[PDB]
Amino acid sequence: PEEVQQAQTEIKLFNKWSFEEVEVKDASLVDYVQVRQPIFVAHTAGRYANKRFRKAQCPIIERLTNSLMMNGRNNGKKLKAVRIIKHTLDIINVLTDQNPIQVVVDAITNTGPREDTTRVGGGGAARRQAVDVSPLRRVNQAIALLTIGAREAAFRNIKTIAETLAEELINAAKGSSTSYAIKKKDELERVAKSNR
Amino acid sequence: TPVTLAKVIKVLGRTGSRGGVTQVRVEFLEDTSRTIVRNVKGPVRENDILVLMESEREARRLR
Amino acid sequence: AQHAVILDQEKYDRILKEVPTYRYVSVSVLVDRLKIGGSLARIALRHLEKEGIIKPISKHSKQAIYT
Amino acid sequence: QVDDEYAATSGIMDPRIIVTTSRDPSTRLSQFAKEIKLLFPNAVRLNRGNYVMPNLVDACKKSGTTDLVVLHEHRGVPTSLTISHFPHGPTAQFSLHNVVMRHDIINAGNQSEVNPHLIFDNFTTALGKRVVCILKHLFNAGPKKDSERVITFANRGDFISVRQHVYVRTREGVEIAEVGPRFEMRLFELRLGTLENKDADVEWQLRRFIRTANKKDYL
Amino acid sequence: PGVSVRDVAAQDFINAYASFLQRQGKLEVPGYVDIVKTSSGNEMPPQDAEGWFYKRAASVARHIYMRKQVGVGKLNKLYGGAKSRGVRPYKHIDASGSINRKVLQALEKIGIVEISPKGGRRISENGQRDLDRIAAQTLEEDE
Amino acid sequence: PQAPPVLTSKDKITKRMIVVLAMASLETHKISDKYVLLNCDDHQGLLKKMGRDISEARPDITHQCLLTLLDSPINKAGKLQVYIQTSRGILIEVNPTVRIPRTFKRFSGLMVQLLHKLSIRSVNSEEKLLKVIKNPITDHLPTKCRKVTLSFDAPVIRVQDYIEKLDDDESICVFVGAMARGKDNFADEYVDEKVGLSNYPLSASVACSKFCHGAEDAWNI
Amino acid sequence: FQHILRLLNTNVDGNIKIVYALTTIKGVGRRYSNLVCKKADVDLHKRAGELTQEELERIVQIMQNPTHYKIPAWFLN
RNA sequence: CCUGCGGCUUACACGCGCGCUACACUGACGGAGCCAGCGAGUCUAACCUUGGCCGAGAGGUCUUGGUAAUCUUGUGAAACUCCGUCGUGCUGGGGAUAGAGCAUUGUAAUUAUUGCUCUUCAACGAGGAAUUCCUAGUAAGCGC
């Protein structure tokens, strides 16, 4: 068909958003976020969970696609997550028509809590010790916080999951702390610097 | 408050502490002279990159 | 009734003032208490005449029509 | 007596174990599988999820394993057990009845999982010999001179019962503390073919609707 | 270059064949559709219960074009699902037998249903011609 | 008009506060069928055989604090929840939607039903008021809170000035223990300050009523 | 649009569609409501702000005279 | 709500535990599409079956296929996918709860044995103290 000829030259993301010209804003995420893979759909179910750093081999978009089916009511549903991801990407490209990939990457870069904190047992005296956060660890924490805020949005609201996800992604791209993930990153930095 | 960047030179070994957090030697990515041990909690490796919110803070043995 | 367009004429005026501009989606067309006594979520059903404001977003369906 | 299932490997190599379950365990059945794991030395376990048993056992066999135990249950509590000795060895299919749970009663110390001391009590008939050799070749070869972990098999009344006891050689005698589960174990078949066959040579089946099996032990 | 119902879509050609039957008009639908739910495992009645029988007949014609022959057991299990039996586990049930037998009689009226080899259901020259006409009408659905 | 909303852990960033009671004699002592409470002057064999003391064990301190606290004007303005740390470590969260009877027989019956239940219900069958958060109070409380022990030995100041100095987004918390012989250290590790209100020793009901009177004139509650 | 009104000594709202407002009464369920809406020749998606008292008394008489209008004996409560 | 060890009773106010169902818009109902494997099955008996039939359904009609890859059987399975309906409403989520009718046995269902249908529409607004298991085709969810 016509879109078959269109995608025959440029392998866009589902032939609706270009899978090129994606940029990572924040530093310390190069080789921690997979954005160099030209693919068609985020369901490449090859064996990547076996190793530690092979989890960075899957795309962060495919990581969020796995994060959609993270609930008792939906653990193991694939095409529901894929269609919801396509709807959320269309909602992002409607709210911000630059690129769903670029806007999502900007939100991921702006939703990162740069510091961490640990509770040390101390032999019976727990204390708050500020510690660093690893690159893939920070990326996974941001993705998890975003998916959790999106899931917590659709508790008493007729809004679609794609709609709440796009609203949280817009709040994270703005960094306005109007989403749970951005509020969580701000509170995490505040707590880490509270006991630095 | 611009947090600098740091490339880990190597993961510092024998850092006895609570399981989950480890001291690792990182030289700052802003300048390759500022190098210090830092307490990283996430799953990390060597020759990676990270954000350091403190300039001259250095990790110690945390028992 | 008493007009068969009750809560759907002044509300229709507000929608033509606002919803024909930004626009909203099929989920955000429930704004301004779009409820019973008319069409709560069926704004996309009647959006055949109005077009050229924003693409739609269908949850149960899957469509994006520039209305 | 050592058998052709054990002659080339009885005291030669010390064994490893694999503990698993039939299909979708209940939580308490998993906990009991944990107990039988931590009782045995050389203890490694693996959950069975959506696995074809010829594929599972065949894949486990090239990786190298001496024996495989797998369980059953009836609405939370376990009832059955089988042992499959890998190198064409005999599968044995038992009914297990009673249990005490280390989680349930008290934390009474530790299952130190040292190479334990072995006790097989009151086995006379050649079937008792088969059970003794098959079960002995699952424990570790080489407990020490004073290995304080005494495992105990008792064969009174066709219901072999197992306990674990830990002893200290106190002033006038040993003193023991009760650990591990306590059992009412009873077999009902022996097949020299491994369970992957489903049709091979059954050594032994318990006659059930035979009159005299009210009285008689060992068929 | 060859026009097939298999090339045509599910919902699109389903609506097209249902409208063509509605354009045909004569199908002799049962009177039970005013009260039936088309299955025992169904809970509410069909929303377009007048065109539900038409959609079922269109799907049956599509199956008869795809497969050689089918039966009322095959149609019922094909058009069958689970049940709202309460809280006990719901197995899959079949569809209504009398509705299936009536629909089998309903498609031989238009000549779409014929007795297959060793009995069963097949298509005729009139049924194949009507299917080809509906498919060619749906072949021009690309506008 | 309308009454103010539910003042609990759900109302966290809004205007709310916590009244915390602890070191009371609140458990379930079944007399050998049903569940009863530990009374000093009522049961002589049972109290002496339990191992407690007549001067030490006090089960009506919580009832008196509830009688002097649930009827507060600030409590009808929707600004306070109730947190109770029992002698057995039980943490209880109470919204101000209802008011327990001051009758220690009826209040003790309701407390024994809660002790045998951990479950209370509403007449409207829509709002189970007796919530039990993850223990203690500060494990699920509001995200902005102020913690202080109102001791008779701490710095005695007026309740209007300190409460007026507090922000409207924080949640001022007060810990009270009405021991006949005791000390202001029951929730010392939880309190982030040590302040005083009275120059004489008072029970939990009197100190709680003084704090409620101070909070009522603080932001006109 | 109409609000609740007195129908068979009940207060029934009309802003909701014709199935479920015709269900809240003792002796009528989902399927009975659906089939009496089928038999009273009313559109299944209408809300009862419309359907003036002609059709309301028609469904009253289809309640008190159901077997006249093909309500079968196997359908009875 | 079923159910494994503990009180008390008969010729019922209970203590320790295992499961399923739900507590709704990734939802619920109407129609469309659909991808399996495991085996099982009847000779002097009637099993497993195909179809046509009628009855909403439940259920009754004669026959071949099969003593077995042949006929079930491609078990056209369920979750799954599309649109339709609906708006967060303790409603259409939810059916514990009853009554009535229908088949359907069986000598009888009577102690709703079972299956359909209608009607009845409880709690359940996410569950504290605790709490187990778990590192990939894994937890998890679905069916034959």
Residue whose token pair is 């956060």: A133
Of G30, G39, G70, the CB nearest to E44: G30
Structure tokens at D20: 């698993």
The radius of gyration of chain A from alpha carbons, rounded to an integer in Å, stands at 18
**G39–E43: do the CB atoms touch at under 8 Å?**
no
E122 touches strand H (CB under 7 A): no
In contact, F173 and F147? CB cutoff 8 Å: yes
User: How far apart, in whole angstroms, are the C-alpha atoms of residue D150 and residue D178?
Assistant: 10
3-state secondary structure of B38: strand
Distance, angstroms, CA E52 to C1' H30? 9
Between strands F146-150 and F172-176, the pairing is: parallel
**Residue in C closest to A93 by C-alpha:** C55
3-state secondary structure A107-134: HHHHCCCCCEEEEECCCCCCEEEEEECC
Altogether, the residues listed in chain F come to a count of 221
Q: Residues F40, F46, F47, CA angle at the centre, nearest 5°?
A: 35
CATH of the domain at C18: 1.10.10.10
In contact, D3 and D133? CB cutoff 8 Å: yes
Closest CA to D72 of D18, D17, D21: D21
Chain C residues touching chain A at CB-CB below 8 Å: 25, 27-28, 30, 41, 54-55, 57, 59, 62, 64
CA-CA distances (angstroms) from residue E28 to A120, E57, E73?
79, 11, 21
User: How far apart, in whole angstroms, are the C-alpha atoms of residue E46 and residue E35?
Assistant: 10
Q: Indicate left, alpha or beta for E98 from its phi (over 0: left) and psi (-120 to 50: alpha).
A: alpha
Q: Residues A41, A47, A49, CA angle at the centre, nearest 5°?
A: 100
CA-CA distances (angstroms) from residue F183 to C12, D155, E117, F9, F136?
69, 64, 98, 28, 20
CA-CA distances (angstroms) from residue D153 to A89, D120, D164, D175, D184?
65, 5, 9, 19, 10
User: How far apart, in whole angstroms, are the C-alpha atoms of residue D170 and residue D172?
Assistant: 6
Closest CA to F159 of F203, F96, F209, F205: F209
| Window 80-99 of chain F: CB closer than 7 A to strand H | 89, 91
Indicate the DSSP class of residue F139: G
Domain residues of chain B, as ranges?
Answer: 1-63
Q: Residues F217, F220, F221, CA angle at the centre, nearest 5°?
A: 90
In contact, E3 and E87? CB cutoff 8 Å: no
G8 touches strand H (CB under 7 A): no
CA-CA distances (angstroms) from residue G3 to C6, C37, G50, G58?
13, 10, 11, 20
Indicate the DSSP class of residue F133: P
3-state secondary structure of F47: helix
Distance, angstroms, CA E49 to C1' H90? 31
User: How far apart, in whole angstroms, are the C-alpha atoms of residue F42 and residue D48?
Assistant: 61
Closest CA to E75 of E97, E108, E91: E97
Between strands D17-20 and D67-71, the pairing is: parallel
User: How far apart, in whole angstroms, are the C-alpha atoms of residue F82 and residue F6?
Assistant: 12
Tell me if chain E has a CB within 8 Å of the CB of G72: yes
In contact, D160 and D154? CB cutoff 8 Å: yes
User: How far apart, in whole angstroms, are the C-alpha atoms of residue D146 and residue D163?
Assistant: 18
CA A194 from centroid of its chain's CA atoms: 27
User: How far apart, in whole angstroms, are the C-alpha atoms of residue D15 and residue D6?
Assistant: 11
D27 touches strand H (CB under 7 A): yes
In contact, D18 and D68? CB cutoff 8 Å: yes
Domain residues of chain A, as ranges?
Answer: 1-196
User: How far apart, in whole angstroms, are the C-alpha atoms of residue C7 and residue D7?
Assistant: 92
User: How far apart, in whole angstroms, are the C-alpha atoms of residue F158 and residue A63?
Assistant: 57
Closest CA to F86 of F111, F64, F53: F111
The class (CATH top level) of B1-63 is mainly beta
Domain count, chain C: 1
Paired strand residues for D186: D95
In contact, E52 and E29? CB cutoff 8 Å: no
The torsion of the CA quartet D2, D4, D8, D10, rounded to 10 degrees, works out to -30
3-state secondary structure chain D: CCCCCCCCCCCCCCCCEEEECCCCCCHHHHHHHHHHHHHCCCEEECCCCCCCHHHHHHHHHHHCCCEEEEECCECCECCEEEEEECCCCCEEEEEECCCCCCCCCCCCCCCCCCCCEEEEECCCCHHHHHHHHHHHCCCCCCCCCCCCEEEEEECCCCCEEEEEEEEEECCCCEEEEEECCCCCEEEEEEECCCCCCCCCCEEEECCCCCHHHHCCCCC
Q: What is the dihedral sign for C-alpha D168, D172, D173, D176?
A: negative
User: How far apart, in whole angstroms, are the C-alpha atoms of residue D186 and residue D188?
Assistant: 7
Distance, angstroms, CA D23 to C1' H20? 17
The alpha carbon of residue A2 is apart from the nearest alpha carbon of chain C, in Å, by 20
In contact, G1 and G48? CB cutoff 8 Å: no
User: How far apart, in whole angstroms, are the C-alpha atoms of residue D175 and residue F114?
Assistant: 48
Q: What are phi and psi of F212, to 5 degrees?
A: -65, -40
Q: What is the dihedral sign for C-alpha D46, D49, D54, D58?
A: negative
CA F105 from centroid of its chain's CA atoms: 19
In contact, D9 and D88? CB cutoff 8 Å: no
User: How far apart, in whole angstroms, are the C-alpha atoms of residue G77 and residue G71?
Assistant: 11
CA-CA distances (angstroms) from residue C19 to A15, A131, C13, C32, G2?
29, 49, 10, 11, 27
CATH superfamily of A1-196: Ribosomal protein S7/S5 (1.10.455.10)
Query: Which residues in chain A are closer than 8 Å to C28, comparing Cβ atoms?
Result: 163
In contact, A182 and A107? CB cutoff 8 Å: no
3-state secondary structure of F172: strand
In contact, G66 and G72? CB cutoff 8 Å: no
Closest CA to D60 of D193, D191, D196, D192: D196
Tell me if chain G has a CB within 8 Å of the CB of E35: yes
E63 touches strand H (CB under 7 A): yes
User: How far apart, in whole angstroms, are the C-alpha atoms of residue E21 and residue G73?
Assistant: 34
D97 touches strand H (CB under 7 A): no
Single-letter residue type at F185:
N
User: CB-based contacts of G39: which residues, under 8 Å, 6+ apart?
Assistant: E34, G62, G69, G70, G71
Distance, angstroms, CA F28 to C1' H142? 46
Q: Is residue C49 part of a domain?
A: yes
Greatest CA separation for chain B: 32
Query: How many other C-beta atoms lie within 10 A of the C-beta of residue C44?
Result: 19
Angle, helix A180-194 to helix A135-153, in steps of 10 degrees: 130
User: CB-based contacts of D192: which residues, under 8 Å, 6+ apart?
Assistant: D5, D88, D89, D90, D200, D201, D202, D203
Paired strand residues for D96: D185
In contact, A158 and A92? CB cutoff 8 Å: no
User: How far apart, in whole angstroms, are the C-alpha atoms of residue A170 and residue A88?
Assistant: 11
Structure tokens at B22: 């480890």
Closest CA to F66 of F37, F91, F97, F102: F102
User: CB-based contacts of C7: which residues, under 8 Å, 6+ apart?
Assistant: C37, C38, G1
Range of the domain at C26: 7-67
In contact, F78 and F4? CB cutoff 8 Å: yes
Return the nearest residue to H2, CA–C1': E88
User: How far apart, in whole angstroms, are the C-alpha atoms of residue A61 and residue A45?
Assistant: 13
User: How far apart, in whole angstroms, are the C-alpha atoms of residue F61 and residue F54?
Assistant: 14
User: How far apart, in whole angstroms, are the C-alpha atoms of residue E79 and residue E100?
Assistant: 10
Chain H nucleotides with an atom closer than 7 Å to a protein C-beta: 3-4, 13, 17-21, 25-34, 50-60, 73-96, 99-102, 115-121, 123-125, 128-130, 132-134, 136-144
- Name where chain D breaks: residue before each gap, C-N > 2.5 Å: none
Return the nearest residue to H119, CA–C1': G77
Indicate the DSSP class of residue B11: P
At least 3 CB pairs under 8 A between chains D and E: no
Q: What is the dihedral sign for C-alpha E33, E38, E41, E43?
A: negative
3-state secondary structure of A137: helix
In contact, D160 and D148? CB cutoff 8 Å: no
Residue whose token pair is 């309903």: E106
CA-CA distances (angstroms) from residue F55 to D73, F48, F65?
56, 12, 18
In contact, E79 and E96? CB cutoff 8 Å: no
Which nucleotide has its C1' atom closest to residue E35's CA? H56
- Name where chain G breaks: residue before each gap, C-N > 2.5 Å: none
Tell me if chain G has a CB within 8 Å of the CB of C4: yes
Resolution (A): 3.5
Indicate the DSSP class of residue A185: H
User: How far apart, in whole angstroms, are the C-alpha atoms of residue G17 and residue E60?
Assistant: 33
Query: Which residues in chain G are closer than 8 Å to E49, comparing Cβ atoms?
Result: 38
Tell me if chain G has a CB within 8 Å of the CB of E31: no
In contact, A149 and A168? CB cutoff 8 Å: yes
User: How far apart, in whole angstroms, are the C-alpha atoms of residue D132 and residue D129?
Assistant: 5
CA-CA distances (angstroms) from residue F80 to C8, F141, F213?
44, 12, 13
Closest CA to D186 of D128, D125, D104: D128
User: How far apart, in whole angstroms, are the C-alpha atoms of residue A100 and residue A170?
Assistant: 11
Closest CA to A147 of A179, A187, A113: A179
Paired strand residues for D77: D74
Distance, angstroms, CA G28 to C1' H112? 22
In contact, E39 and E77? CB cutoff 8 Å: no
Query: Which residues in chain A are closer than 8 Å to C64, comparing Cβ atoms?
Result: 90, 94
**B50–A137: do the CB atoms touch at under 8 Å?**
no
**Residue in E closest to G31 by C-alpha:** E44
Bond from prior residue into F136 cis (ω within 30 degrees of 0): yes
End-to-end CA distance of chain C: 30
Distance, angstroms, CA A75 to C1' H139? 9
In contact, C36 and G16? CB cutoff 8 Å: yes
Bond from prior residue into G53 cis (ω within 30 degrees of 0): no
Closest CA to D93 of D124, D75, D69, D73: D69
Residues making up the binding site of F: 150, 177, 182-184, 197-202
Q: Indicate left, alpha or beta for D75 from its phi (over 0: left) and psi (-120 to 50: alpha).
A: left
User: CB-based contacts of D161: which residues, under 8 Å, 6+ apart?
Assistant: D153, D154, D182, D183, D184, D185
Residue whose token pair is 């007729």: A158
Between strands F91-94 and D174-179, the pairing is: unpaired
Q: What are phi and psi of B21, to 5 degrees?
A: -125, 140
Q: Please report the DSSP string for chain E in residue order.
A: ----TTTS-HHHHHHHHHHHHHHH------GGGGT--SBSS--SPPTTHHHHHHHHHHHHHHHHHHSS---HHHHHHHT------SSSPP----B-HHHHHHHHHHHHHTT--B--TTSS-B--HHHHHHHHHHHHHHHTTT-
Tell me if chain G has a CB within 8 Å of the CB of E44: yes
Residue whose token pair is 């939370």: D76
Of G34, G70, G75, the CB nearest to E45: G34
In contact, A94 and A162? CB cutoff 8 Å: no
Paired strand residues for D93: D82, D189
User: CB-based contacts of D20: which residues, under 8 Å, 6+ apart?
Assistant: D33, D45, D46, D47, D48, D68, D69, D70, D71
User: How far apart, in whole angstroms, are the C-alpha atoms of residue A12 and residue A14?
Assistant: 6
Structure tokens at D6: 């054990």
Distance, angstroms, CA A90 to C1' H81? 20
* Experimental technique behind these coordinates: cryo-EM
CA-CA distances (angstroms) from residue D58 to A89, A119, D17, D63, D87?
46, 46, 15, 9, 11
Between strands D117-121 and D149-154, the pairing is: parallel
Single-letter residue type at A34:
Q
Indicate the DSSP class of residue A7: H
Q: Please report the DSSP string for F8-27 in residue order.
A: SSSS-SSS-EEEEEES----
Altogether, the residues listed in chain C come to a count of 67
